[PDB]
Design goal:
- Chains C, E, F: This is Transmembrane protein gp41.
- This is part of a larger assembly, with one copy of chain A, one copy of chain B, three copies of chain C and three copies of chain D.
- By secondary structure, chain B is mainly beta.
- Chain B has three helices and 26 strands.
- In chain B, about 10% of the residues lie in helices and about 30% in strands.
- The two termini of chain B are about 20 Å apart.
- Chain D contains no helices and eleven strands.
- In chain D, strands 2, 4, 5, 6, 9, 10 and 11 form a seven-stranded mixed beta sheet that branches. A four-stranded antiparallel beta sheet of chain D has the order 1-3-8-7, with no helix packed on it.
- The chains are: A mainly beta, B mainly beta, C mainly alpha, D mainly beta.
- The interface between B and C is large, with 50 and 65 residues.
- Bound molecules: a molecule of 5 linked components (NAG-NAG-BMA-MAN-MAN) (2 copies), a molecule of 4 linked components (NAG-NAG-BMA-MAN), a molecule of 3 linked components (NAG-NAG-BMA), a molecule of 2 linked components (NAG-NAG) (5 copies) and 2-acetamido-2-deoxy-beta-D-glucopyranose (15 copies).
- A molecule of 3 linked components (NAG-NAG-BMA) binds near residues 16 and 17 of chain F.
């Protein structure tokens, strides 16, 4: 039971500001961490794999980093299309576990 | 100490070979006819890393197999129904004067003949409307009475394009790659493997490609040896141009029996006004996509050269005019109104007049006919222009004022725009390898 | 290594990997050598039958050639015949961990006829020696 | 691949909930993981369990023995059964496809657990 | 026991006999998987060719799969794959000599895939273990 | 052993040879049972397909009985079945070197079905005896 | 199955007796036992010998070496030869097929051994 | 098989001798051993060398590097070249077929080495 704890739930931001989301793992297991993006009325979409690399089609403004128990996702130069829910997860051993999720507000 | 040779079976080793292909279609017709095995629509696209495989067009036999494949499919659907042996009768044609325009004066002929009825000892007088491209003077006769007898096209079937998938038996594989800057023949750095392809439209054209696959990022000028002028230049679009082709005529179809159980459909009397069949493309997006093409035409030539566009060289009606298969009746369209451009260094529609032919000559063999029956109502078509075919001209002096012209006439180039990614390979599973063994006696 | 990170390589997936990485995936490659047309007019009447018997005869020729060498029924079989080093003067460290089977074939494609013919003469010799010793 | 959930949209408490996921475009006997995931009111996701192409079953321990997941390979369908339901199990139920950094979800269906 | 009391067992004659009694009937079943049309135009020309290839590649499908498990050339073989208590909660005395093969396959028809996948993985596990001890 | 004494046996070249000399020649007579049509309309859509699938079925028929006897994949298989002396009253020295194999097959043509069926009756017993000693 | 006996109805003493059994409706190379049985005057039966499906032989010892039994598998026929005949061997000769609790007899043929 | 020798019948000393053997009725690329043998005045035979179907060459060591033997597989011909000739090399040159306890010879041709 690896527990994935996210910092807070709702944070207000403005267009053009850097925003950073954080996730704290109960153990320091690996660097195999993924972020998913979920817009309202849509299914979640995989965004980052292995914590630092970008998926095809993902815009360059999305970056991620961290190791151990600390992993930071950074959004830079926020546009309207980044309104969504974001979730940290681990993909090392079963059971699968989800974050509580963070909702962005503009 | 010394390594001894072993045998490894089933290891992936490829070999460039050619084998027969196999159709696959999703859920009568003229291509499928409920004969192709309905494949499971799961393209196993396993991306392969650190694999560089050399592709080669213009030597690929898939486009030679595909051209041979649907020629036999065209003749298969024309055999079990009626032909038109008794239409070679001397005609009595006169000009149509019922609400005609000044430009189409003489296009339609009102012809009557003595075609036989269902009883072999009686005859009937049947009148019909024939276009001027299907009758010649002797008062008139059909244009193919000195050529072989012709079929009826049997209007229970349709000519609507249906996606068709080609893939090999067990022990073979199909390799495709998704490079955005992919040329004609070269090593491609993103080779993947798939069971077989996506939907391929068998739609027919001679000058402009319709309903093809769009380019990935930019317009690619994809052709072989370019100092030669005898080889065509294939252009693939990334942003399509919407083309509307229609005919507002109120055509009436008359069913006349030629014999026992053998019907024949001909054009009856017209209702309303006689107008041409016009094709519309917007002048904004066509000028936008012409500049995007000549921007990529300047990579293989000089920067200060002058690129000019001209119409076709003329001659036969198959190659010179635009030909396509929308609406069930064939359009042969004059296309001189799209190439009024001169490109040097540094209002929402275009009208195109068209001619409609009923006696249709398909691929360059002369012994086959095609008689499209008349269709009730008004034909309305919404298609996309997703390609071009250009043929260069010789006699260029000092590599200046070099122009591009359309042409071709070979129908194999239509499917090279769709099969430019796929190739067939043969799996060789048997192989050897040295490591540390000793066979236990 | 679970969920989306699990191994689901499938057919022809190890064609870009190394020597030792591709040696564990010989089962999945030979699985697709017979099936695929398991679910079912002149056209594609002769084409369908010529499609299968051409594929069957190649699979039987590989198994019969394996059965001549005495490696029938095995996926990784190894014999005890020596080979001359002039074909490749490379040690195991420089071959079995850093190169792909695709570029390996072109370097020994000159000598496949020689190295195959040395195997039936090798295999028949133990059977000759088995007949002398056990009688 | 296309996934489509189906089943009754109203289930009486303490009775059993059955849903069907109809799969098209891919064969359930070949690869990857086949999951059921639900979304509660308030946009929270909880993983219930999965299936493999070989018929192995795994479940979230928090659901105890309340879940059996079963399939019909002839119809290319797999099935959810949920015993001993409560109104706090009311949620939108998705059948989703995961692996090789691919992720496809059905459109989902709504179910309300009430008498 | 002889004469009219002699038993020749026919073909498919062990369908109603028990699983223990059918353990010696394996030979007569396998010999009828290829022959039948040994003695000899669109109708009845393609109908034999479609059936002849289908009768061959299904036999090769069940024979190649035997060779992946390491059971090539044998009729009754047995591997090191541990079948577990969840698949069938019965002892060997409650399976062999009190019921037949026909309805035994119905309870295992759900678990046919999980059985087949572990055997091909276990054979490749012991191929590399043979490589370590031999070197 | 060279010049006129060199070996250029080819296909079926040991047809009139003695059985000791022809015992070395079983390798070259196996590969020409499936090949020959390795490289490529009513006529010959049946005349070619009917003979190609017949060569497959005759090859798998010979291999399958070689698998029922328990020693498939072996060119020279020698099993543990005693033979009756009534079929041939000739010793080892009067068989292997004085007469050609062609006329020997006619001598045992009548007694082929007795000896072809006794092999698998002592092989199922062999596999049953292997199961008892293993566990 | 149908069995039909044929051959000469008169044989001279000390000469050889040959009979043919023509079999139709079943193949002699597959299964069961293929027998010759004769019935003497006075309704007495004596078994002479049998055949296995694989062409093995066996004979009643009372007939010593007087009997060879043979077959032709191309014509699906099997054959009786009886050496050194005597007039007390005069009888009606049947060819019969027996096994699996199925016994079938031919119609029989008559033979007289006299000079 | 038939073998026929051809070439110039007179060669000047120190120059090169070339002869052609034309083979018909059998292919030299799937085959036996093909030899050149000559007969001196006084009827003595000396073997010069052979060829194999795989292109390997063999020569009598006594002839040093004086002889190259070559072939044209399109025309099914093989060739003798003899450098640095002397009048003691005058002889009747045969091209020969030997193998499998079979031996076939051409009719031969005469050559004189003189000025
Ligand atoms: C296409 O080609 C590329 C590059 O050639 C392959 O990518 C890697 O290639 C290397 C070179 O052989 C493989 O070697 C591995 O090196 C590891 C340490 O090196 C660094 O690895 C990464 C950077 O690649 C760093 O994150 C890391 O900190 C190291 O600095 C070794 O640790 C590996 O050994 C074992 O590691 C773990 C231990 O459990 C296992 O998971 C591994 O499988 C391995 O057994 C190894 O020697 C490396 O494997 C390649 N990467 C991957 C992901 O495979 C591509 O793989 C190749 N494409 C394909 C399809 O093969
Ligand atoms: C390139 O591709 C495009 C689109 O893929 C092709 O455009 C289609 O062309 C076909 C024939 O070439 C047209 O089919 C004709 O449609 C006529 C009018 O259809 C109306 O009436 C129908 C009967 O009452 C009615 O069903 C239909 O509704 C829907 O039906 C279609 C299925 O039949 C469906 O796909 C459409 O979405 C449509 O909304 C219409 O109300 C009809 O009278 C003809 O008998 C014939 O069926 C299609 O309509 C064209 N598509 C569109 C969107 O207009 C184009 O031809 C291709 N290019 C070439 C060169 O072939
Ligand atoms: C001819 O050119 C035109 C453009 O000039 C091109 O337009 C296509 O129009 C159709 C119909 O409007 C589009 O089809 C749909 O568009 C929606 C967006 O409105 C997409 O989301 C759809 O894609 C998926 O939608 C669902 C969500 O996954 C799926 O359930 C569904 O099955 C689809 O997979 C759907 O495509 C189409 O998008 C455009 N094309 C483009 C590139 O925008 C038309 O395709 C051209 N015709 C031909 C024959 O090429
Ligand atoms: C047809 O019959 C003749 C016999 O009259 C065969 O001649 C035989 O040829 C073989 C060639 O291998 C001889 O075997 C050799 O024997 C010597 C010992 O003498 C041994 O040292 C060699 O290694 C080799 O085994 C054999 O002796 C000879 N027979 C006799 C009686 O001398 C001829 O080959 C037959 N044709 C065939 C087989 O095609
Ligand atoms: C081509 O014909 C269509 C047929 O109506 C024209 O109208 C468009 O139709 C599509 C749907 O088929 C709509 O999405 C567009 O909004 C319609 N356009 C307009 C302006 O209403 C279309 O305009 C024609 N295009 C050209 C270039 O002539
Ligand atoms: C194709 O374009 C032509 C010209 O742009 C269109 O012709 C017009 O038709 C309307 C009647 O619907 C007339 O009121 C206009 O006067 C015509 N234009 C001209 C310049 O005369 C034609 O309708 C278009 N066809 C389609 C299918 O879009
Ligand atoms: C292509 O354009 C040329 C003009 O460059 C056309 O040639 C004209 O042909 C007509 C009769 O066919 C003559 O009366 C004109 O004098 C020609 N023009 C010139 C400048 O000489 C040609 O017809 C066009 N072809 C098509 C198919 O439209
Ligand atoms: C295609 O259309 C163009 C113009 O719509 C035709 O070109 C005209 O040809 C006549 C013939 O003498 C000239 O008088 C005109 O000046 C030309 N117009 C233009 C704009 O060039 C052309 O002939 C047509 N082609 C066919 C085959 O009908
Ligand atoms: C069909 O089932 C019956 C069950 O009554 C079998 O009869 C048994 O046969 C065995 C030996 O064949 C005896 O040892 C038992 O005593 C029999 N009776 C029982 C078990 O009650 C019969 O053999 C079965 N048929 C076949 C062909 O196996
Ligand atoms: C009929 O049309 C043709 C076509 O140009 C023309 O030559 C002829 O003069 C016309 N006849 C009449 C009577 O209008
Ligand atoms: C064609 O001729 C027939 C003959 O009577 C006539 O009825 C018909 O109206 C004519 N068609 C036209 C368009 O004038
Ligand atoms: C058709 O036949 C009638 C018969 O009376 C004749 O008058 C008429 O001229 C014929 N027309 C043609 C075109 O042959
Ligand atoms: C048939 O006649 C037309 C009309 O002139 C002509 O163009 C064509 O070449 C002729 N074809 C043959 C095969 O004679
Ligand atoms: C791609 O185009 C041709 C096609 O083979 C090739 O010769 C050339 O080197 C490639 N690259 C460029 C930049 O044209
Ligand atoms: C074709 O390519 C060759 C280079 O392979 C070049 O020399 C030649 O000029 C090109 N054009 C023609 C017409 O041969
Ligand atoms: C054309 O006229 C016919 C004749 O009545 C009619 O049925 C048809 O609907 C008309 N078409 C249009 C588009 O008005
Ligand atoms: C088409 O584009 C060219 C490129 O600048 C421009 O000169 C020309 O005026 C444009 N034509 C129209 C009709 O807009
Ligand atoms: C033509 O211009 C482009 C930039 O638009 C430049 O990259 C290219 O090098 C130029 N061509 C030559 C031959 O200088
Ligand atoms: C194309 O249009 C321009 C615009 O006036 C005209 O000058 C030119 O002659 C036209 N060319 C053709 C071939 O119609
Ligand atoms: C060395 O290689 C040659 C290949 O030309 C081969 O004939 C020979 O037998 C080899 N030697 C050894 C000792 O393997
Ligand atoms: C073997 O032959 C091929 C083709 O003749 C040649 O490309 C290759 O270089 C040869 N191998 C070696 C080691 O030279
Ligand atoms: C086997 O599967 C079927 C359908 O999936 C199911 O009805 C049956 O209960 C299952 N059997 C067992 C023992 O679980
Ligand atoms: C099923 O078998 C596996 C090993 O094959 C074992 O680990 C597992 O515990 C077994 N299942 C149960 C419920 O015991
Ligand atoms: C073998 O059978 C044939 C015909 O069936 C017979 O002529 C021959 O004598 C028999 N041979 C022996 C040894 O019995």
């Amino acid at each position: 039971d690896i527990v994935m704890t996210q910092s807070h739930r709702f944070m207000s931001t403005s267009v053009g500001d850097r925003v950073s989301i954080t996730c704290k793992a109960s153990q320091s297991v690996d660097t195999a961490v993924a972020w998913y993006q979920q817009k309202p009325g849509q299914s979640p979409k995989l965004l980052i794999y292995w914590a630092s690399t970008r998926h095809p089609g993902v815009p360059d403004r999305f970056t991620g980093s961290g190791s151990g128990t600390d992993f930071i996702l950074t959004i830079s130069n926020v546009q309207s299309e980044d309104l969504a829910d974001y979730f940290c997860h681990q993909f090392d051993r079963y059971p699968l576990t989800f974050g509580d999720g963070t909702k962005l507000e503009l | 100490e010394n390594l001894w040779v072993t045998v490894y079976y089933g290891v992936p080793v490829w070999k460039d070979a050619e084998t027969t292909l196999f159709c696959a279609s999703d859920a009568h017709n003229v291509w499928a006819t409920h004969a192709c095995v309905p494949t499971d629509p799961n393209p196993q696209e396993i991306h392969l890393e650190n694999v560089t495989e050399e592709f080669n067009m213009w030597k690929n036999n898939m486009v030679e197999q595909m051209h041979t494949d649907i020629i036999s499919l065209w003749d298969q659907s024309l055999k079990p129904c009626v032909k038109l042996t008794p239409l070679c009768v001397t005609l009595q044609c006169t000009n149509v004067t019922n609400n005609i325009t000044d430009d189409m004066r003489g296009e339609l002929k009102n012809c009557s003949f003595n075609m036989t009825t269902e009883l072999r000892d009686k005859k009937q007088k049947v009148y019909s409307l024939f276009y001027r491209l299907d009758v010649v003077q002797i008062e008139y006769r059909l244009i193919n009475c000195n050529t072989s007898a012709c079929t009826q096209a049997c209007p229970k079937v349709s000519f609507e394009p249906i996606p068709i998938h080609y893939c090999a038996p067990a022990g073979f594989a199909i390799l495709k790659c998704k490079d955005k800057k992919f040329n004609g023949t070269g090593p491609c750095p993103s080779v993947s493997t798939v069971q077989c392809t996506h939907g391929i439209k068998p739609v027919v054209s001679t000058q402009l490609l319709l309903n093809g696959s769009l380019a990935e990022e930019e317009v690619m000028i994809r052709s072989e040896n370019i100092t030669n002028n005898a080889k065509n230049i294939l252009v693939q679009f990334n942003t399509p141009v919407q083309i509307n082709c229609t005919r507002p005529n109120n055509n009436t179809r008359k069913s006349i029996r030629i014999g026992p159980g053998q019907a024949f459909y001909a054009t009856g009397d017209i209702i309303g006004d006689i107008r041409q069949a016009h094709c519309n493309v917007s002048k904004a997006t066509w000028n936008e996509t012409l500049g995007k093409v000549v921007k990529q035409l300047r990579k293989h030539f000089g920067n200060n050269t002058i690129i000019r566009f001209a119409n076709s060289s003329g001659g036969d009606l198959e190659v010179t005019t635009h030909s396509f298969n929308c609406g069930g009746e064939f359009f042969y369209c004059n296309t001189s109104g799209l190439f009024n451009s001169t490109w040097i260094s540094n209002n929402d529609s275009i009208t195109l007049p068209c001619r409609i032919k009923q006696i249709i000559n398909m691929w360059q063999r002369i012994g086959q006919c095609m008689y499209a029956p008349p269709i009730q109502g008004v034909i309305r078509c919404v298609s996309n222009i997703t390609g071009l075919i250009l043929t260069r001209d010789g006699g260029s002096t000092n590599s200046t004022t070099e122009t591009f012209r359309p042409g071709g006439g070979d129908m194999r180039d239509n499917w090279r725009s769709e099969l430019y990614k796929y190739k067939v390979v043969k799996i060789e599973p048997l192989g050897v390898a040295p490591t540390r063994c000793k066979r236990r006696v | 290594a679970v969920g989306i990170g699990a191994v689901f390589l499938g057919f022809l997936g190890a064609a870009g990997s190394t020597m030792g990485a591709a040696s564990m995936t010989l089962t999945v490659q030979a699985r697709n050598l017979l099936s695929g047309i398991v679910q079912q007019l002149t056209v594609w009447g002769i084409k369908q039958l010529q499609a299968r018997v051409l594929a069957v005869e190649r699979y039987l020729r590989d198994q019969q050639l394996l059965g001549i060498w005495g490696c029938s029924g095995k996926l990784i079989c190894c014999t005890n015949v020596p080979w001359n080093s002039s074909w490749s003067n490379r040690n195991l460290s420089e071959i079995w961990d850093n190169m792909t089977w695709l570029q390996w074939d072109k370097e020994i494609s000159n000598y496949t006829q020689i190295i195959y013919g040395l195997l039936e003469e090798s295999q028949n010799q133990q059977e000759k020696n088995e007949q002398d010793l056990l009688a | 691949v296309q996934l489509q959930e189906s089943g009754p949209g109203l289930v009486k408490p303490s009775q059993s909930l059955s849903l069907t996921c109809s799969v098209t475009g891919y064969s359930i006997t070949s690869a990857y993981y086949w999951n059921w995931i639900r979304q509660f009111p308030g946009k929270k996701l909880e993983w219930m369990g999965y299936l493999l192409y070989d018929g192995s079953t795994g479940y979230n321990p928090s659901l105890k023995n309340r879940i059996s997941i079963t399939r019909d390979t002839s119809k290319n369908q797999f099935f959810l059964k949920l015993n001993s339901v409560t109104p706090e199990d009311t949620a939108t139920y998705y059948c989703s496809r995961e692996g090789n950094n691919r992720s496809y979800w059905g459109q989902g269906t709504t179910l309300i657990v009430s008498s």
